[PDB]
Structure formats: C-alpha cells, structure tokens
Amino acid sequence: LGSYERQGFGAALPLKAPYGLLIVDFVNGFADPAQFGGGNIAAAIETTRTVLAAARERGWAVAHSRIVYADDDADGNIFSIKVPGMLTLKEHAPASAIVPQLAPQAGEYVVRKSTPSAFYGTMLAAWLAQRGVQTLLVAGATTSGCVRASVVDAMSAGFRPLVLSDCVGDRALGPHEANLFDMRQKYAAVMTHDEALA
C-alpha cells in the first residue's frame, strides 16, 4: 500500500464552484435494515439533511436518485439477476420512495435508474452540464455500490466529485471504508460534511 504514494496516488482534488449536490438512493428500502440493509446507512441519511438544507440555502443545483424498475419487470436486467430484490423497486412501491427527511423540493431533479450509477442511462450528466456544475458533493447509499459507481461516473463525465464520508453509508462497514479508500486514492475529494460546507 506504499505504492499509492510512490506512484503518485491520492492527489488533492481542488474544489471549484458552481456546486451541486447528488444524493444517491437514500430510499425507504435502503434506510430500513429489514429490506436492503443498515450498517451506517441510517446515520448517513440524517447527517445528509444538513448538507441538503445547506444546498438549498446556497442556491445549489440538487439531484436525487431512485432505483426504479417497471411494474411488469420490463426493464429487468443483469443487475436485477445478481441482486434479485432490486426488481421490487417499482415506481409506486413505498420501498423505492425517497425518505421523508430528504424529500425533494422546488427545481431539484429526481433521476430514475435501473443501474448502480446515477449517470449511466440517465440524463444526470447533461442536467449538471446545462447548469454548469463544476464540483458535486455526493451522498447516499450504498457506499460500495451505487455511490461509488455514481462517483466514478461523475469523475469521468467531467465533474469534481466531493464524497461526504459522513453522508454515505453501507450495510457493511468493511466494504464502506475500502470503497472510501479507493475513491480517496483515485476518484475525488473525500472529507466529512462540516469540512465540505466550510
């Protein structure tokens, strides 16, 4: 693991406005640990609220993500084979719904996805492109799933990702911190929410 600093990894990603905020799948099925798990997801959702309000106070473009399949499993995919309970994430299923504490407002965009990433076959890139977004704070679940996937795509799409370490949670803490490492060492700025805001 010394190879990372030798070969020049983990360089700081300087921060640049305009800012935006992406919250990825903080949805009833991911908050409640009976369905799609809880390690530090419950905690992450709640801390995120400060950011969200911070977002709305500064006039930040904000985007929320939801995994949504079609009711007749029309768009059932390779993903929903590997993790079968994702098919159950239908448009009206309470389980697919954003959690009351992060409920969307005003001109904030809600993106429906059938993949891990909030960019993949969505209009997220162009929405942020259009709004001239340079740096993008990310929050959500899962750290080792949709978050990271969404985070690497933010990067590739041309956005300076800033991962809120205390605003992403997983059902599993080991994966949680390894994916923070990967991301810290390769794909974005990685700091807690009070730090980000400042």
Positions 26 through 65 that interact with its own copies (CB under 8 A): 33, 35-39
Q: How far is the CB of 57 from its own copies (least distance, A)?
A: 18
Nearest to 23 by CA among 198, 151, 181: 151
- Residues 49 and 103: their CA atoms lie apart, in Å, by 10
Q: Which of residues 106-125 bind its own copies (CB under 8 A)?
A: 106-110, 112, 114-117, 120-125
Q: How far is the CB of 20 from its own copies (least distance, A)?
A: 12
| Annotated catalytic residue, options 146, 183, 189, 196 | 146
Contact between 149 and 114 (Cβ < 8 Å): no
- Is 167 one of the annotated active-site residues of the chain? no
> Is 29 or 47 the residue whose CB approaches its own copies more closely?
29
By CB under 8 A, name the one of 40, 47, 144, 165 that touches its own copies: 144
Contact between 158 and 152 (Cβ < 8 Å): no
Is residue 82 close enough to count as binding its own copies by CB under 8 A? Answer: yes
Site string for its own copies, 164-193 (x = CB under 8 A): -------xx-xx--xx-xx--xxxx-----
- Residues 16 and 154: their CA atoms lie apart, in Å, by 14
Is residue 20 close enough to count as binding its own copies by CB under 8 A? Answer: no
Query: What is the DSSP code string of 137-161?
Result: EEEES-IIIIIHHHHHHHHHHT-EE
- CB hemisphere CA count around 50 (13 angstroms): 14
Q: Which of residues 145-164 bind its own copies (CB under 8 A)?
A: 145, 149, 152-153, 155-161
- What backbone torsions phi and psi does residue 182 show, to the nearest 5 degrees? -45, -55
Q: How far is the CB of 25 from its own copies (least distance, A)?
A: 13
Q: How far is the CB of 97 from its own copies (least distance, A)?
A: 15
Torsion-angle region of 170 (φ positive above 0: left; ψ -120 to 50: alpha; else: beta): beta
By CB under 8 A, name the one of 15, 54, 90, 127 that touches its own copies: 127
Is residue 94 close enough to count as binding its own copies by CB under 8 A? Answer: no
Contact between 26 and 99 (Cβ < 8 Å): yes
Q: How far is the CB of 174 from its own copies (least distance, A)?
A: 7
User: Which residues are tagged catalytic?
Assistant: 146
